[PDB]
Design an enzyme around this catalytic site. Structure first.
Site, short mmCIF file in Angstrom:
data_model
loop_
_atom_site.label_atom_id
_atom_site.label_comp_id
_atom_site.label_asym_id
_atom_site.label_seq_id
_atom_site.Cartn_x
_atom_site.Cartn_y
_atom_site.Cartn_z
N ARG C 11 -1.21 -33.34 -18.67
CA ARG C 11 -1.90 -32.19 -17.88
C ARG C 11 -3.37 -33.19 -17.25
O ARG C 11 -3.22 -33.06 -16.04
CB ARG C 11 -2.64 -31.10 -18.69
CG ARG C 11 -1.48 -30.33 -19.27
CD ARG C 11 -0.09 -29.78 -18.21
NE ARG C 11 -1.03 -28.99 -17.45
CZ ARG C 11 -0.47 -28.64 -16.17
NH1 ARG C 11 0.44 -29.39 -15.59
NH2 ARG C 11 -1.17 -27.91 -15.39
N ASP C 33 4.05 -43.55 -20.00
CA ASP C 33 4.36 -42.22 -20.77
C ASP C 33 5.41 -42.43 -21.70
O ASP C 33 5.64 -43.61 -22.12
CB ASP C 33 4.44 -40.79 -19.91
CG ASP C 33 4.20 -39.53 -20.50
OD1 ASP C 33 5.13 -39.19 -21.33
OD2 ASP C 33 3.36 -39.07 -20.50
N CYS C 150 -13.50 -30.59 -22.82
CA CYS C 150 -13.51 -29.90 -21.62
C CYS C 150 -14.72 -28.93 -21.98
O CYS C 150 -15.53 -28.50 -21.08
CB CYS C 150 -12.30 -29.33 -21.32
SG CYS C 150 -11.60 -28.41 -22.94
N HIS C 177 -10.65 -19.71 -24.51
CA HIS C 177 -10.27 -20.73 -24.37
C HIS C 177 -8.84 -20.63 -23.91
O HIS C 177 -8.11 -20.26 -24.72
CB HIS C 177 -10.35 -21.89 -24.94
CG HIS C 177 -10.01 -23.17 -24.47
ND1 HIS C 177 -8.95 -23.76 -24.22
CD2 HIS C 177 -10.95 -24.16 -24.18
CE1 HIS C 177 -9.07 -25.02 -23.79
NE2 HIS C 177 -10.34 -25.47 -23.83
N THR C 180 -3.25 -24.32 -24.93
CA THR C 180 -2.88 -25.78 -24.48
C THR C 180 -1.60 -26.01 -25.08
O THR C 180 -1.01 -25.34 -26.26
CB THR C 180 -4.09 -26.48 -24.64
OG1 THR C 180 -4.41 -26.68 -26.05
CG2 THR C 180 -5.39 -26.13 -24.18
N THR C 210 -13.80 -26.09 -32.97
CA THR C 210 -14.01 -26.90 -31.74
C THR C 210 -15.38 -27.74 -32.39
O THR C 210 -16.21 -27.31 -32.98
CB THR C 210 -14.33 -26.41 -30.63
OG1 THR C 210 -14.67 -27.29 -29.75
CG2 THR C 210 -15.12 -25.31 -30.83
N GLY C 211 -15.56 -29.05 -32.17
CA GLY C 211 -16.64 -29.76 -32.16
C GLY C 211 -17.42 -29.91 -31.17
O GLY C 211 -18.51 -30.60 -31.40
N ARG C 233 -8.47 -18.88 -28.67
CA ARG C 233 -7.52 -19.53 -27.64
C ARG C 233 -6.73 -18.04 -27.34
O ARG C 233 -6.66 -17.28 -28.21
CB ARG C 233 -6.71 -20.37 -28.25
CG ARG C 233 -7.09 -21.58 -29.06
CD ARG C 233 -7.52 -22.47 -27.80
NE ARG C 233 -7.85 -23.81 -28.39
CZ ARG C 233 -6.92 -25.06 -28.41
NH1 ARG C 233 -5.66 -24.80 -28.08
NH2 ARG C 233 -6.98 -25.91 -29.05
N1 LIG Z 1 -5.58 -29.92 -21.35
C1 LIG Z 1 -6.98 -29.64 -21.67
O1 LIG Z 1 -7.63 -28.79 -21.35
C2 LIG Z 1 -7.87 -30.98 -21.82
C3 LIG Z 1 -9.00 -30.97 -21.59
C4 LIG Z 1 -9.97 -32.05 -21.71
C5 LIG Z 1 -9.27 -33.23 -22.66
N2 LIG Z 1 -7.94 -32.95 -22.92
C6 LIG Z 1 -7.59 -34.16 -23.64
O2 LIG Z 1 -6.81 -34.93 -23.23
C7 LIG Z 1 -5.68 -35.42 -23.62
C8 LIG Z 1 -4.28 -35.19 -23.43
O3 LIG Z 1 -4.13 -33.89 -23.23
P1 LIG Z 1 -3.18 -33.12 -22.36
O4 LIG Z 1 -3.44 -31.52 -22.32
O5 LIG Z 1 -2.72 -33.48 -20.96
O6 LIG Z 1 -1.75 -33.07 -23.27
P2 LIG Z 1 -0.25 -33.21 -22.89
O7 LIG Z 1 0.59 -33.34 -24.03
O8 LIG Z 1 -0.21 -32.72 -21.58
O9 LIG Z 1 -0.27 -34.80 -22.42
C9 LIG Z 1 -0.11 -36.00 -23.40
C10 LIG Z 1 1.03 -37.00 -22.76
O10 LIG Z 1 0.71 -38.16 -23.20
C11 LIG Z 1 2.28 -38.61 -23.69
N3 LIG Z 1 2.30 -39.29 -24.65
C12 LIG Z 1 1.94 -39.24 -26.09
N4 LIG Z 1 2.01 -40.11 -26.83
C13 LIG Z 1 2.31 -41.18 -26.18
C14 LIG Z 1 2.28 -42.70 -26.37
N5 LIG Z 1 2.14 -43.22 -27.49
N6 LIG Z 1 2.34 -43.39 -25.15
C15 LIG Z 1 2.33 -42.96 -24.02
N7 LIG Z 1 2.32 -41.70 -23.64
C16 LIG Z 1 1.99 -40.84 -24.68
C17 LIG Z 1 3.08 -37.37 -23.77
O11 LIG Z 1 4.26 -37.64 -23.44
C18 LIG Z 1 2.34 -36.43 -22.68
O12 LIG Z 1 3.01 -36.56 -21.45
C19 LIG Z 1 -5.93 -35.21 -25.12
O13 LIG Z 1 -6.54 -35.98 -25.85
C20 LIG Z 1 -6.57 -33.64 -25.10
O14 LIG Z 1 -7.56 -33.32 -26.00
C21 LIG Z 1 -7.44 -32.06 -22.65
#
Ligand SMILES: NC(=O)c1ccc[n+]([C@@H]2O[C@H](COP(=O)([O-])OP(=O)(O)OC[C@H]3O[C@@H](n4cnc5c(N)ncnc54)[C@H](O)[C@@H]3O)[C@@H](O)[C@H]2O)c1
Ligand SMILES: NC(=O)c1ccc[n+]([C@@H]2O[C@H](COP(=O)([O-])OP(=O)(O)OC[C@H]3O[C@@H](n4cnc5c(N)ncnc54)[C@H](O)[C@@H]3O)[C@@H](O)[C@H]2O)c1
Ligand SMILES: NC(=O)c1ccc[n+]([C@@H]2O[C@H](COP(=O)([O-])OP(=O)(O)OC[C@H]3O[C@@H](n4cnc5c(N)ncnc54)[C@H](O)[C@@H]3O)[C@@H](O)[C@H]2O)c1
Ligand SMILES: NC(=O)c1ccc[n+]([C@@H]2O[C@H](COP(=O)([O-])OP(=O)(O)OC[C@H]3O[C@@H](n4cnc5c(N)ncnc54)[C@H](O)[C@@H]3O)[C@@H](O)[C@H]2O)c1
Lengths: 332, 332, 333, 333
Positions: C11, C33, C150, C177, C180, C210-211, C233
């Site tokens: 995302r 990915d 976020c 929230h 997710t 949440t921290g 959530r």
């Molecule tokens: N979605 C939100 O609201 C949000 C907001 C802020 C931060 N985040 C942070 O961003 C990060 C990703 O969250 P997201 O919501 O996009 O999750 P997501 O699961 O949509 O994305 C993770 C992606 O990483 C890939 N992946 C996993 N392990 C991998 C590896 N070893 N090598 C390569 N690719 C790999 C997965 O295939 C997937 O496409 C997390 O740390 C999350 O906490 C998310």
């Protein structure tokens, strides 16, 4: 510019203003609903499925100013009392859902408008148009016309190609349709006595009747009496698809069917080959989007059954078809 | 006293334990999953769609106590290592989704179990049973069998009645299906390369392939090669329906079709005439629930196309069919 | 241009590519990915909550062509082996969720990248930045930094104004929230042992920890140890809000608080007075959107309790904050 | 033999009949709505959130037969034309939402009914009862009373325990609330002019006002003026929770609070220690279900801020409280 009034500032009415604002040579002079102007402006600006309005919108005494131009706002439930004559209104988009036949819709002409387009099926005595299929039946002498239903605008271009290139013996339609405002939020009595629309919209698969296939003869005369079907409302807030299972007059293959649909593609009828889902169709401007990935031709002992599927945003696809029909009509 | 082990304590595995607790002659001696016993107990007690377990369930070390009775808990992703021989397990319900053919399911036989029932299609190398349609193909000497899919258990009784009473030339199926765990919570890569199951489950109408119609010949041999179909996943967490559009060998009316379904109705095949929606089917114990309110027979120039619809809770309807097949099998 | 690689095309990773495409002087050279290029291209083009990509996107052999420019695609789960050095990657956006501390994130430095920005809290030993609050702590010599969560990007601008203009004694945060991808589609075992994230995401109000408030000291040191909070959530696919119930050091009125927030407004911190709901925030580019309509100051015998609320699209608001931090960081080196 | 009539066969009215069918000495003689009997029977039998009715229900001539006993059905939208005197109606459960003060509710009295219980707040001039908190204010001589709101029935037992065991200086409430029928299915004009309830119920976090905390003084006089709060509607069809962030008069620990709540737990006020979510609460018969897993006591330099959270099924929890209040009231008339 041709002057338009929108009666019913609902899902279709508000999006109709968005699309008309992007058009030149035609402008909305007034809108009418049951609520004060502040409520209408807020709903025009903010939309849960179609996004924020990409333009300016401000409030005035009893008007909204959209992209710098004033639009009068009225709150009168009886169309006969609206000041359409005083405002020089040429065409009324009837989008309330309460005036969906000729005699009811004519209250607008008694109010001073020249023409009325019903944003829904309007009976068998008014011309009914799917833009891109049969808009040419209009010549401007009609006083009340219909833009059909969202489902008819999705089915008609797909069914027209099957009839012209293969011929149709018969077909049964199933539209898997987003829930709409005529379904209750939670289980509660329903105004029309519909036991299934009485149920919580976002929790249920809800079988419901539709006339899109039965009435298809008004749009495609050669298919009169050959189609029927039904609907299943499901918990997506917008975005729908239409399946057609048909017996054809000649043999067909999936590749021949898909090629014919692509050849007929236009601004109203898109052609798709991606593995899309309903949310990908939200906000599209095609009236119908044929999905070549879902075409199936089954042969059992030389007998063939054919499935074809087209997507549509029941809100924005239909609204764009309605506005195209309005613009074509207004030139006559 | 037939001893059962559940491999995969998921949606089907946990509901199967609920049903086996209400059954005579069969008891669950052990369950296996990838997670600690505390997690399994919590998921057994609390269920977002099927409700809280109406019974007692407490935790012991490496065990859960259900209605006062001990069930061993294991967390071993390798079925080949499980202690089925020392526990004396007679039958394993294989419900992980990862061992859905004979060669993989036989790991439980090498591990000491006597029989395996796969809670899914198991390949043409394995007998496939929809209870109430073809359970007589079992003579008890089989080592691994399959209870088919949820959609197959819904479709088979409906198609069997049509075949017996009218004969079927061909048919196309559309199942409007609850989303399941093989769909992602939000748009994300999908392990199997499925671009449509990659999409957010609760936001989309999602076309997807299914073999229920394609494989119907394994359950009803006379319908082999005459049915095909596909699926549309929609945002309900459970509860589904199957539409079948068929060409029949003999003329039919809506009343004749409905009367035949009602006459055939049973504990596996329910009959409904109320204006129900999907939430009314959550938790039902029929494998399939025919809906007479949706029957349609269309006639155009003497040619007929027929629509019939049956509901099913893809979770609990299938689970009860699985337990019925398990009980019948264990008696041989 | 500064060349960027996205590890984890999820995302945040995919929306980050959309925003970087609109930026000048910085370009995404590669994404990585676990999946084939056709899957990544499809998810980049089509998005259930954020809409279709407004641009061109085509497939090539082990690459996607975005707006006429090639981006190489890799499918290696171990970041050590990615060709970041061979591609001249300056900064890696680490968005997988599996490398969210300093030593793990350094696999990209050992792979040839110069810098890493973690799209999540990255531990107490890496600089953690909410753009528009504390980006000035970056001097460009850092190797691994964090753009926080976020929720932190939503809370921090709101809490900073309260601290500067009124002073904060203590506060409890509740973030309502969107669900997710770390929540299950239906009731099922959860990899981290979380009994509440194990439950069906779109069917439940789901309490979760949440921290963001506890770690606020990394962004606003003056608030260290003064905030804690939790999350709920709920079944919206994206879009969230953060409530803060705080005891202030000085008396306040609803009008005074709202005036202070509007004065602090920027591209990162919007100010809202309309009666909006969560869907209105989907796709916004503010990191946080203060909602003046929800401010409440309660007085009981001279004792005051204050409620302030800010919206945020946890996907796009954070993504834009992430890109703003990336751009400022890349400017320093 | 207390004879009850239900005016408004909606969510609360239909569930009230389900519970009264399980109660001894009280029976429903008639129901009234705007719709034919066939619609009402269908909605009584089939329910999307509370499940199918566990009993017999059939249609007769302008009546429904529930568990073998016939209940007359009326469709008169004007309450004071109803034949309550002719039927001997002792108590009317007023559940339409359109007669929520003493003046309007007295239409049932002029129609020959002895008493009315409003299934909602009824104004500052009608006694308001949360059963298990203040039912002792009823002496049977009243003609119109109120069972308060669902949120009030959730908050009151929790706030009462905090007041008795620690004392309350002030508190701010946030109820995360299931969407209800006063929200539109899709964005559309709203009859009451509420710009946020006009929005699609199942797509949005929707801020909305509530009087439960401000009006708490009607149920717990010592807390009068001491509480306020608001609501956030979210896309669950039923099931809710109430958070209270309060300043207490003496120091407290989460263990002390949880122990006090557990000791006071009853059929009206449940106590929970499992990691439940909102769907686990659908259909419960507690008016409020304290969740000890969410209790938080934050201490910053000796100053304490306390979070306590209680669940409630806004439909079934409130309905059971309504029937409890009805039985107690009827035992005094
Ligand atoms: N979605 C939100 O609201 C949000 C907001 C802020 C931060 N985040 C942070 O961003 C990060 C990703 O969250 P997201 O919501 O996009 O999750 P997501 O699961 O949509 O994305 C993770 C992606 O990483 C890939 N992946 C996993 N392990 C991998 C590896 N070893 N090598 C390569 N690719 C790999 C997965 O295939 C997937 O496409 C997390 O740390 C999350 O906490 C998310
Ligand atoms: N929503 C769809 O997908 C869709 C598609 C095609 C056609 N339509 C048709 O469009 C019409 C409107 O449907 P909608 O979905 O926009 O519904 P809606 O309820 O969102 O809009 C109806 C509007 O009309 C107003 N209204 C009602 N009675 C009125 C009166 N007497 N005078 C003035 N205003 C009045 C209401 O306040 C409301 O704003 C219906 O005929 C419907 O069948 C809807
Ligand atoms: N859910 C339905 O509607 C439905 C209906 C009919 C059939 N099925 C079939 O039932 C099977 C299970 O589906 P489900 O919906 O219960 O899926 P699920 O993901 O809910 O359950 C699978 C369970 O197996 C566990 N598991 C996975 N690998 C394992 C391993 N190696 N060892 C032990 N445990 C392991 C997982 O932890 C999980 O609890 C699949 O074959 C599915 O096709 C599902
Ligand atoms: N649903 C909840 O969570 C909840 C909880 C506590 C209290 N309440 C209160 O209970 C009342 C009912 O709410 P609900 O959720 O059941 O709403 P609802 O709309 O589901 O029920 C109202 C019923 O009354 C009928 N009705 C309306 N006007 C009428 C009239 N003039 N004469 C006869 N019948 C009429 C409607 O047809 C409908 O069946 C409201 O006061 C509400 O605030 C609701």
């Amino acid at each position: 510019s041709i002057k338009v009034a929108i009666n019913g500032f609902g899902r279709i009415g508000r999006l109709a203003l968005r699309q008309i604002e992007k058009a030149h040579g035609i402008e909305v002079a007034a809108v009418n609903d049951l609520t004060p102007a502040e409520m209408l402006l807020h709903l025009f600006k903010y939309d849960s499925t179609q996004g924020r309005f990409q333009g300016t919108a401000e409030l005035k005494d009893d008007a909204i100013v959209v992209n710098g131009r004033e639009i009068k706002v009225f709150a009168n439930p009886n169309p006969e009392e609206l000041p359409w004559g005083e405002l020089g209104v040429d065409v009324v988009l009837e989008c309330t859902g309460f005036f969906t036949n000729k005699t009811k819709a004519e209250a607008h002409i008694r109010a001073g408008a020249r023409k009325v387009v019903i944003s829904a099926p309007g009976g068998n005595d008014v011309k009914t148009v799917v833009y891109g299929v049969n808009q040419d039946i209009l010549d401007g002498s009609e006083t009340v016309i219909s833009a059909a239903s969202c489902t008819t605008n999705c089915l008609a271009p797909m069914a027209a190609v099957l009839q012209k290139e293969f011929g149709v013996v018969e077909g049964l339609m199933t539209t898997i349709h987003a829930y709409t405002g005529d379904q209750n939020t939670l289980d509660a009595p329903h105004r029309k006595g519909d036991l299934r629309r009485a149920r919580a919209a976002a929790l249920n698969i809800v079988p419901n009747s539709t006339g899109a296939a039965k009435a298809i003869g008004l749009v495609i005369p050669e298919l009169n009496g050959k189609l029927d079907g039904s609907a299943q409302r499901v918990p997506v807030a917008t975005g729908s698809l239409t399946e057609l299972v048909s017996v054809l007059e000649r043999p067909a293959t999936k590749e021949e069917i898909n090629a014919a649909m692509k050849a007929a593609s236009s601004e109203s009828y898109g052609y798709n080959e991606d593995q899309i889902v309903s949310s990908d169709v939200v906000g599209i401007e095609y009236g119908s989007l044929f999905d070549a990935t879902q075409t199936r031709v089954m042969t059992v002992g030389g007998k063939q059954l054919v499935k074809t599927v087209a997507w549509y945003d029941n809100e924005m696809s239909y609204t764009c078809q309605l506005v195209r029909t309005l613009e074509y009509f207004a030139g006559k």
